[PDB]
Design a protein around this nucleic acid. Structure first.
Lengths: 106, 194, 33, 163, 118, 140
RNA sequence: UUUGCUCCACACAAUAUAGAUGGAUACGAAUAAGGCGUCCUUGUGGCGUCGCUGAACCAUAGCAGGCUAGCAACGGUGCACUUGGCGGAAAGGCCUUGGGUGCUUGCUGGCGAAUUGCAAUGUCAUUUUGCGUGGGGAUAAAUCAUUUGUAUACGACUUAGA
RNA sequence: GCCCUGGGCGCUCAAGCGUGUUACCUAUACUCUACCGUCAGGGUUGAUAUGCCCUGACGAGUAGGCAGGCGUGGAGGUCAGUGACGAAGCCUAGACCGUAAGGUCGGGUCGAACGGCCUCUAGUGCAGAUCUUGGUGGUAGUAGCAGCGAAACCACAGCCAAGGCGGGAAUCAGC
RNA sequence: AAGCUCGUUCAGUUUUAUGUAAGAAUGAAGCUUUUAGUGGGCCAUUUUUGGGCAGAACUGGCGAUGCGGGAUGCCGAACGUAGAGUUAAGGUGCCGGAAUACACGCUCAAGACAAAAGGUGUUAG
RNA sequence: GGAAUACUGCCAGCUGGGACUGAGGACUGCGACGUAAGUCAAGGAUGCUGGCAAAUGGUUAUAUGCCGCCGUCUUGAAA
RNA sequence: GAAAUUGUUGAAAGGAAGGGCAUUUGAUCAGACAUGGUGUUUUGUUCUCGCAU
C-alpha cells in the first residue's frame, strides 16, 4: 500500500488564551474532518505527536518527537484541547500534528 | 487537503472571502486567488468608489497611504487588515498568499475552488445593487482591464476544446460502464454499497 | 483523612443511613401508587 | 416558549379571573399581581392566589385564525390594538404577536397586555390582508433563492440556489 | 525510597528590580509598579513559596548536606548516616581530605563534594 | 508503610474483544497488520496469531488498548492455546520451540482462514488509512 | 586557484525546513436556472433525467512492499528512447507515434517474515552549501592610469588610446 | 419600528437594530486537591516538651505598631576548630541550599592568618541626597596648532495619523 | 497594648404593640489605661435652590487597590504559591481564545449634544 | 372508550469514553460481604511490564505566541 | 589586583534593547559516586572460629 498513515492529521492553532493573556500549558489542536464536539469526543485521550527535524543527530536518530495527550473538546467547531509534557514552541502555530489512534476502545 | 488551494474570485464577496482566506492562512493553509478582477463588493458603485477615494486622501505624508491601483493589491490590502501583520506569525501567513488577475499559468491546468459562504450571489439579497470592482479599479487609475479581458478571452478558448475532449472521453467511459453493467463484479459491488 | 463522598462509592453510602439497603432492595425510588 | 396559565384571586368574594401567558408559573403570578393593581386596588399581602393551573390547547393539530386584542404601553402612553394571526395554538399565536411587536413597535413582555384571544371560523371575518391572503382555496407558490448550509469550508461545484 | 519528588515551586532565583539596566544595582533582592505587582512584572517573594517541611533543605540526592572539618564531626554522623551526608569545607587542605574521605567511606557516609584538590 | 487496601481485581475486557476476532495493531514492527485474537494472558496481554504462515506475524503478546477491534470473527475452538503462558515469553536467535509451536498453531487455523473466501488475502494485506478517511465515522 | 569557470553523470558530508506522510482530482456562463444522452422539421427548440453537497472521483492488497511457478489478454502501468503537435500571462508544462524493458492483486499456487521480546515518528521529501572522479563547452569583462568638455561648487557625468 | 436634512479590515436576507432559544470563549471570582505561614481548639511526662503532633479557619494594603531572621567591625567562653600539602581577598555561562537578607562547594591568581557555635558590644547594610574623594567613556581625532588635541553636554527617547501632557546604509546642497 | 471577670453579652440585621415587659427570628460581652499615626479633596447620591450658574445640609466609593472586561481613562471581582472543573462582567467574521448558530421584521445611508419640524423614504394599528 | 407520548421531578437505577489528583505511612476507628474462618470500592495506590551511560533536567544565548525608567513632590489617585 | 572603560579570538543578527509567563534550537553542566546487598567448601597459626577469597 502506498499510504502507511495510521494517525489522523490535524493542525495547531494557538494555546488557550484570553484577549491579552495566554497560557501555553494548554494547546488548541484542530483535527481534519471533525466539525462538532460530538465527533471530537472519540479522539479524547488519543496521543498527539509532533515531528520536527534538526541538523544535529540526537541520541537515537535525526528525528525528535514530543509525546502529548488529548484532554477535552473546545469550541463549537470541534476543536480539541491538547496537553503536552513539554509545551510546543510558539513558532509552530498553524503547523500540522499527528494524532494516533491509540489508546482505543472500539 | 490539497497542498495549495486556488480560489476563483468570480461572483464572490471581498469581505467574507478575505476573512476566510486570512483565517485559513493563520491555520497554516496555502491559498491562491485568481480572477480577482471579477470580484464583487456589496453596495452600489458610488458608495464603494467613495469609500476607496476617501482612503486615498486620509493621510498617514506619502510614507503611509499609497495610491495603489491594482485590484489584486486592493484585495490584499483588504485581507492585510484581517491578519496580525508586522509580526513573524502574521507575515509568514501572508507568504502563503498570491493574487493574480485572471488565471495565469500553471494554475490554468489545475482545478480551482470556490467558497460557498463567500458567494456574492448566494449571500447578497436578490435585486439589490452591487459593485463589480473592475469598474472601480478602472475609474481609480487601473488601466490593464482591457488587456486582462483580452488575454482572458484566449483562456476560455483552448480550455473549451479541452473540455470538449474531456466530454468525449467521459462519454466513452460512460458507454463502457453501461455495457459493463450487469456483470457479476458490478452486481457484487452494488450489493456491497459500491 | 479523606472525605468519602456519598451517592458515589456505595460502600461509604451504606455507612450512613442503614435504610439505604432496604431502599435499594425494594425499588422504593420507583414505587407504584 | 410561552405557556398559558389561568390565575384567579380574591384578596382573601368576586374571584377576579384572567388569563396570563408566561414562561413559568412564577412569572405568571407576578404578571397577575401587576394586572390586579391596574384592574382594581389590591396588594400582594392582601390575600393569596386561590388557584393557578396551566391550560393546554384542546387540540394542537388544527390551524386557527386567532383574533387577538392586545394593549401595549408605547413611549407616549398606552393604546388599544387588535390583530389577527394565523397559527395552530394560542401559545404560539401570542409568541408570534410578541415577536412582531418587539420587531416593529419594540414593545416587549414588560409593556404588553393580552386582553382576549378568539378563533375565527368564517372567511371574510378577518379584515387584515396579510392573513386574508391565506384563507383562499388551496394555492401554490414557489420558494425562490433557496440556500443550503455548506458544512465544508470549500466547494467545487459552484452551488445553485434553485429549488 | 523516601525520596519523593521535590518541587522547587520557583526554580528561577529572584533578581533585584531594574538591576540589569543599571550596573551599580546589585542582584540581591531588595524591596522598593513592582510594589503594586502589576501584570507582566517580576513576582515578589512571599509566604506562598515556602518549601515543604518533610523535604526542606534536602538535596536532589535526598540527603542533608552537613559541613565537616574533623574526624569527630564525621563520626557524629555515624548514627544519622541515613539522612545526613558529609561535606568538606573549602579551607580543608588536601592532606586531611584523604583521611576524611577514607573515614566517610569506611563509615558509609556519602561525600557531597569529593575529589576536592585531589 | 500502611496496609494499603487495594485488591488485585481481575481485568475486565471490553465486549468488543472475543477469541477468534480479527485484530489490528497500531504500534510495533507489525503496525498496520491484521492479526487474529486467541487467548487473554494473566499479564493482561492478548495472545494473538497472524497466522505466521499467512502474513509472517508470529505468536506475540499485545495490549488491548493498542488494538482496534473488528466484527470479522473466525473459529478458534480447535487450537489448543493452553500450552502458551507468560513464562513462554521470558528471556532473562529464534528458539527451536518457537518454530514448531507456531507451525502447529497455524496448521489448525489456515484451514479456517481458507474457509472464508478472500480472508487469507485480506489478512495478507496490511491495513492502512487513506485520504479523506474518518475513523470516528467508520465502523471498522 | 594545479577542469581554473560553466552544464551534466555518480558520490560522500554539512545544512535546515512557517512544517508531504496517496492525487491543486483544469471549461464557460445564469443563480426567478444550468448541464448530461438523444432527436432534428438546428431553435431562447422537443424528449428522459441530475443536483438538495467532495459524506464523492482516480487509486489503494505484496519484508514500506522480495523471489518464483501456472492460466486469460497483449489491456493497465514504473522507466531509458524516438516521429510530431500544442502551451509567451509568470509559456519551463501538456502530451503524441513505435517498439524496448520490469510489475500486473485480472485469475490460481510454492517460498521468508519471528528476537524491535507489550510501543517508543523507529529514520524513505527536498532547500541550500561543502569535498572526490569523468562527459562535454567557451576562454572574457571592469576599476585606476591616461585624459577628455556637451559636463563642471567638490563628487559625478561624457570620452580617445595596447 | 428604522433612514434622510437634523478600534482597524470591512460588514448590507449584516458581521446593523429589538427581542426569544441553545451551545461555546475565561478573572487572582467560584468548586475539589498539593504545600508555607499566621490565628484558634485539643493529645502529650508512673517520660515520649522552648518539643512530637491531630483538627479547622484565614492569606489585599500606605503611614504606623508588633513578631521572626541574614550579614559587616570589635570583645567574653567553646569547637584540645581551619590553614605554607595554601586561610583572607578577587572572577566564574559550574553546581547545591534557603522563596529572604545570604551560605556552601569545584575551578583560574593569591601569599599569612581566619571560621561555626552560646553571649556582649556599635562609627554595623546605600541608587539616589544639582552628595564628598578618586578613576573612567561618547563627545573626538571635533574646534583647535600637513599639525597637535579640547571643552560644553550626555538616563534613554524622536518619522506622524488622535485621543488617553507624550500608518532604514555615509557624507555632501536650503532654514 | 495594657487588669479584672462575666460567658454569656452584643447588633448600621427585620413586622403588632406605643418606640416597648417582647417566655418574636437571625447571627455571635463590659469598664477601663496610655500609645504611634491621623486637620483631602473628590466620582456618584441625598436635601431637591434660583434662573446661566454657586455655595449648600447628606448617603455609597478612593486615599493605601491588584485582576478580567470597555483599543485607553464605568461593570464584575477585592489578591499566598500550584494542579484540576464552572462562571461574573464582556464576547463568539479576522486581528481575538468562542457558533459566518436557530427563529420573527426592520434598514440603503447609515450603526457598534439632534428629536422643533418636513420626506410622492420604507412597514404596521 | 382506551392507552401512548411531549413536559416536570425522583431513582440510597444500570452502563461507559476523557482530564487532574496518589496526598497519609506497621493495626487500633465507623461500615458491607459471610453459617465461621476470613474478604471488601470500608479514617489517602497498589500489581505487572519496557527503555537506559550519556539517562531526566539545570544556567545561558538567539528567534517565535502574549504582556510591560526611576525616589520626593501637590495630594483627588494627577499629568 | 575588582567596576566603569578599552585591545586579540569565539558565539549574533538587521529609526532599538535590555524586563515578565510556558517551549524548541546552539553551547554547556551537577551527570547514580549504585561501590553497594543476600548464604557455603578450599590453606595455617577441618576452616568460616577469621583473615586472601
Amino acid at each position: 500500500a502506498e499510504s502507511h498513515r495510521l494517525y489522523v492529521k490535524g493542525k495547531h492553532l494557538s494555546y488557550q488564551r484570553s484577549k491579552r493573556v495566554n497560557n501555553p500549558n494548554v494547546s488548541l489542536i484542530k483535527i481534519e474532518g471533525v466539525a462538532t464536539p460530538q465527533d471530537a469526543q472519540f479522539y479524547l485521550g488519543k496521543r498527539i505527536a509532533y515531528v520536527y527535524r534538526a541538523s544535529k543527530e540526537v541520541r537515537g536518530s535525526k528525528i525528535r518527537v514530543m509525546w502529548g495527550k488529548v484532554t477535552r473538546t473546545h469550541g463549537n467547531s470541534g476543536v480539541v484541547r491538547a496537553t503536552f509534557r513539554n509545551n510546543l514552541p510558539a513558532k509552530t502555530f498553524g503547523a500540522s500534528v499527528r494524532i494516533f489512534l491509540y489508546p482505543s476502545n472500539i | 487537503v490539497e497542498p495549495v488551494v486556488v480560489i476563483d474570485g468570480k461572483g464572490h464577496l471581498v469581505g467574507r472571502l478575505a476573512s476566510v482566506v486570512a483565517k485559513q492562512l493563520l491555520n497554516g493553509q496555502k491559498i491562491v486567488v485568481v480572477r480577482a478582477e471579477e470580484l464583487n463588493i456589496s453596495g452600489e458603485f458610488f458608495r464603494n468608489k467613495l469609500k476607496y477615494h476617501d482612503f486615498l486622501r486620509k493621510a498617514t505624508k506619502t510614507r503611509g497611504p499609497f495610491h495603489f491601483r491594482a485590484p489584486s493589491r486592493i484585495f490584499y490590502k483588504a485581507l492585510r487588515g484581517m491578519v496580525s501583520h508586522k509580526t513573524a506569525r502574521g507575515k509568514a501567513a501572508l507568504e502563503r498568499l498570491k493574487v493574480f488577475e485572471g488565471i495565469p499559468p500553471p494554475y490554468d491546468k489545475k482545478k480551482r475552488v470556490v467558497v460557498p459562504q463567500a458567494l456574492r450571489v448566494l449571500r447578497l439579497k436578490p435585486g439589490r445593487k452591487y459593485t463589480t470592482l473592475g469598474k472601480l479599479s478602472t475609474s481609480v487609475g487601473w488601466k490593464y482591464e482591457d488587456v486582462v479581458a483580452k488575454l482572458e478571452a484566449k483562456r476560455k478558448v483552448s480550455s473549451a476544446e479541452y473540455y470538449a475532449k474531456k466530454r468525449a472521453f467521459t462519454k466513452k467511459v460512460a458507454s463502457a460502464n453501461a455495457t459493463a453493467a450487469e456483470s457479476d463484479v458490478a452486481k457484487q459491488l452494488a450489493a456491497l454499497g459500491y | 483523612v479523606l472525605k468519602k463522598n456519598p451517592l458515589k462509592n456505595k460502600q461509604v453510602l451504606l455507612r450512613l443511613n442503614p435504610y439505604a439497603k432496604v431502599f435499594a432492595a425494594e425499588k422504593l425510588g420507583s414505587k407504584k401508587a | 416558549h410561552f405557556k398559558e396559565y389561568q390565575v384567579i384571586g380574591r384578596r382573601l368574594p368576586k374571584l377576579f379571573r384572567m388569563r396570563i401567558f408566561a414562561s413559568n408559573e412564577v412569572i405568571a403570578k407576578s404578571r397577575y399581581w401587576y394586572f390586579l393593581q391596574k384592574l382594581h386596588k389590591v396588594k400582594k399581602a392582601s390575600g393569596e392566589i386561590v388557584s393557578i393551573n396551566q391550560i393546554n390547547e384542546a387540540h394542537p393539530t388544527k390551524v386557527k385564525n386567532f383574533g387577538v386584542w392586545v394593549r401595549y404601553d408605547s413611549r407616549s402612553g398606552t393604546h388599544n390594538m387588535y390583530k389577527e394571526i394565523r397559527d395552530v395554538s394560542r401559545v404560539a399565536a401570542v409568541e408570534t404577536l410578541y415577536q412582531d411587536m418587539a420587531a416593529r413597535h419594540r414593545a416587549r413582555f414588560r409593556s404588553i397586555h393580552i386582553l382576549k384571544v378568539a378563533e375565527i371560523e368564517k372567511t371574510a371575518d378577518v379584515k387584515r390582508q396579510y392573513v386574508k391572503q391565506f384563507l383562499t382555496k388551496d394555492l401554490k407558490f414557489p420558494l425562490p433563492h433557496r440556500v443550503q448550509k455548506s458544512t465544508k469550508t470549500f466547494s467545487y461545484k459552484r452551488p445553485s440556489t434553485f429549488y | 525510597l523516601p525520596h519523593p519528588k521535590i518541587v522547587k515551586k520557583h526554580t528561577k532565583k529572584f533578581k533585584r528590580h531594574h538591576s540589569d539596566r543599571y550596573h551599580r544595582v546589585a542582584e540581591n533582592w531588595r524591596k522598593q509598579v513592582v510594589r503594586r505587582r502589576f501584570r507582566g512584572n517580576i513576582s515578589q517573594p512571599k509566604i506562598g513559596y515556602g518549601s515543604n517541611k518533610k523535604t526542606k533543605f534536602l538535596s536532589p540526592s535526598g540527603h542533608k548536606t552537613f559541613l565537616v572539618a574533623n574526624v569527630k564531626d564525621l563520626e557524629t554522623l555515624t548514627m544519622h548516616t541515613k539522612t545526613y551526608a558529609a561535606e568538606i569545607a573549602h579551607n580543608i587542605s588536601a592532606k586531611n581530605r584523604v583521611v576524611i574521605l577514607a573515614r566517610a567511606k569506611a563509615l558509609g557516609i556519602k561525600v557531597t563534594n569529593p575529589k576536592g584538590r585531589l | 508503610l500502611k496496609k494499603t487496601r487495594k485488591a488485585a481485581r481481575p481485568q475486565k475486557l471490553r465486549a468488543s474483544l472475543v477469541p477468534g476476532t480479527v485484530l489490528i495493531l497500531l504500534a510495533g514492527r507489525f503496525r498496520g497488520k491484521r492479526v487474529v485474537y486467541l487467548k487473554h494472558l494473566e499479564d493482561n496481554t492478548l495472545l494473538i496469531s497472524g497466522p505466521f504462515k499467512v502474513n509472517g506475524v508470529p505468536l506475540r503478546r499485545v495490549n488491548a488498548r493498542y488494538v482496534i477491534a473488528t466484527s470479522t470473527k473466525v473459529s478458534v475452538e480447535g487450537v489448543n492455546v493452553e500450552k502458551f503462558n507468560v513464562e513462554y515469553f521470558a528471556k532473562e536467535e529464534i528458539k527451536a520451540e518457537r518454530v514448531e509451536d507456531q507451525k502447529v498453531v497455524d496448521k489448525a487455523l489456515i484451514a479456517e482462514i481458507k474457509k472464508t473466501p478472500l480472508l487469507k488475502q485480506y489478512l495478507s494485506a496490511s491495513f492502512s488509512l487513506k485520504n479523506g478517511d474518518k475513523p470516528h465515522m467508520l465502523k471498522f
